[PDB]
Design a protein around this ligand. Structure first.
Ligand SMILES: O=c1[nH]cnc2c(-n3cc(CCN4CCC(c5ccc(-c6cccnc6)cc5)CC4)cn3)nccc12
Ligand SMILES: [Cl-]
Ligand SMILES: [Zn+2]
Ligand SMILES: [Zn+2]
Length: 340
C-alpha cells in the first residue's frame, strides 16, 4: 500500500472538533496508514484534560503490586512476577522516588535506553500493574477509556473495563499483542515517560519465529507463549535478526493506540500512571476469528456474535470451517471509506 509504506510510527495532533468522535478518528488515522506500524501516538488538544487534579489519589489501593524479576543475557530475557501485598499510591510513590529505585541521571533517551538494557536484571522494581479503575472524571465524554462505545461492547470477561498502571524506573511490559489480537488505547495520566517498541503487524510472524527459535521449550508447551507476557527481546537482538521495528517515547498527556496483531514492548522512565483498555473496529473481526490463543492457561471471546452481525453472509461458511480468508495487514478499516 502507498499509505505509510515505511510502516513507521505516526503521531497525530487532532483539533477539538476532530477529537470528539473516537471511532471516526481511529478510522481517519487508518486511512493515513497508521495501523501499518502497529502503534500510533495521538496528542490531544491543549484544552482537553481527563481530570482536573491527581492530588486526591494517595489512598488509592494497588491490590497486587508485582516485583519484576528478569533473568537472561545477550538481549534475551524472561520476566518473572512476584505478587506483593496490597499498597497505596502514596507508599508506591515513596518507593518509586527512593534512592534505591529512582531514575538514573541521563542526557538523551539513548543513554537511558542503554541503562535499561544493561541493568534490567538488577535491583528488581515493583510495578503497580492491572489496577481495576479509571482516573477520568464522570463528565468527560471525549476518549473516555472507561466508555469508548466501540463494537466491542457487543461482548458484555472484562476486556472492555479500564486498568491503571503505576510505574517506576525499569518496570517493563514484555513482547505481546492484545488479547484476541484487539486494539488498545493507553493514556499516560502523569509522571515520567513510557518508551515503546513495536513490530509492524505484517512482520509479526517473523518475531514469533524468532521467539520460538530462542525459547523452544516454551513454544512446545504453548503455541501462543508470547501471550504469557514474559519475553523481553532487546532492539539490538531484533536488528541482528532482521526484525523491522520502531520506537517511540510517550510523555504525560499523550495517547498510544496499538492495532490488531501489533507486537509491542517497552519500559517506564520513572514514577508514572497510565490507563488502558481494549477496543475494536469492523477490521478487527477477522483478527478475532484467526487469533492463536494461549493453550496452557486466559482471555477468550466467542466470535459468533460478531460474525452474525457484521459478516452474516460468511456465518455458515465460518461455522463449517470453510472460511479461508487471508488477512491483508495493510488494508484500513471499512469505516475509513469516507476519508478515502
Ligand atoms: O505499560 C504497560 N504496562 C503493562 N501492560 C501494558 C500493556 N498490556 C497489558 C496487558 C494485560 C491486560 N490484562 C495487555 N497489554 N500494553 C501496553 C502497555 C502496558
Ligand atoms: Cl501523585
Ligand atoms: Zn499491550
Ligand atoms: Zn500458554
Amino acid at each position: 500500500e502507498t499509505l505509510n509504506p515505511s510502516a513507521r510510527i505516526m503521531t497525530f495532533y487532532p483539533t477539538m472538533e476532530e477529537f470528539r468522535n473516537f471511532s471516526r478518528y481511529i478510522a481517519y488515522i487508518e486511512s493515513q496508514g497508521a495501523h501499518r506500524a502497529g502503534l500510533a501516538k495521538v496528542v490531544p488538544p491543549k484544552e482537553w484534560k481527563p481530570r482536573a487534579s491527581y492530588d486526591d489519589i494517595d489512598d488509592l489501593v494497588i491490590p497486587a503490586p508485582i516485583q519484576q524479576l528478569v533473568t537472561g543475557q545477550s538481549g534475551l530475557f524472561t520476566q518473572y512476577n512476584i505478587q506483593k501485598k496490597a499498597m497505596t499510591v502514596r507508599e508506591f510513590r515513596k518507593i518509586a522516588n527512593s534512592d534505591k529505585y529512582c531514575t538514573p541521571r541521563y542526557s538523551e533517551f539513548e543513554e537511558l535506553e542503554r541503562k535499561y538494557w544493561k541493568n534490567l536484571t538488577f535491583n528488581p522494581p515493583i510495578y503497580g500493574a492491572d489496577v481495576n479503575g479509571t482516573l477520568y472524571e464522570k463528565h468527560v465524554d471525549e476518549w473516555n477509556i472507561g466508555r469508548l462505545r466501540t463494537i466491542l461492547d457487543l461482548v458484555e470477561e472484562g476486556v472492555n473495563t479500564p486498568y491503571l498502571y503505576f510505574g517506576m524506573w525499569k518496570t517493563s511490559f514484555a513482547w505481546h499483542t492484545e488479547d484476541m489480537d484487539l486494539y488498545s488505547i493507553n493514556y499516560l495520566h502523569f509522571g515520567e515517560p513510557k518508551s515503546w517498541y513495536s513490530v509492524p503487524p505484517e512482520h509479526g510472524k517473523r518475531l514469533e519465529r524468532l521467539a520460538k527459535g530462542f525459547f523452544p521449550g516454551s513454544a512446545q508447551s504453548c503455541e501462543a507463549f508470547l501471550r504469557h507476557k514474559m519475553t523481553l527481546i532487546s532492539p539490538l537482538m531484533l536488528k541482528k535478526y532482521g526484525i523491522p521495528f520502531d520506537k517511540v517515547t510517550q510523555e504525560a498527556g499523550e495517547f498510544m493506540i496499538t492495532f490488531p496483531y501489533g507486537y509491542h514492548a517497552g519500559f517506564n522512565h520513572g514514577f508514572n500512571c497510565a490507563e488502558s483498555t481494549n477496543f475494536a473496529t469492523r477490521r478487527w473481526i477477522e483478527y478475532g476469528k484467526q487469533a492463536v490463543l494461549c493453550s496452557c492457561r486466559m482471555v477468550k471471546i466467542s466470535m459468533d456474535v460478531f460474525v452474525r452481525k457484521f459478516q452474516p453472509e460468511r456465518y455458515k461458511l465460518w461455522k463449517a470451517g470453510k472460511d479461508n480468508t487471508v488477512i491483508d495487514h495493510t488494508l484500513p478499516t471499512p469505516e475509513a471509506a469516507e476519508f478515502l
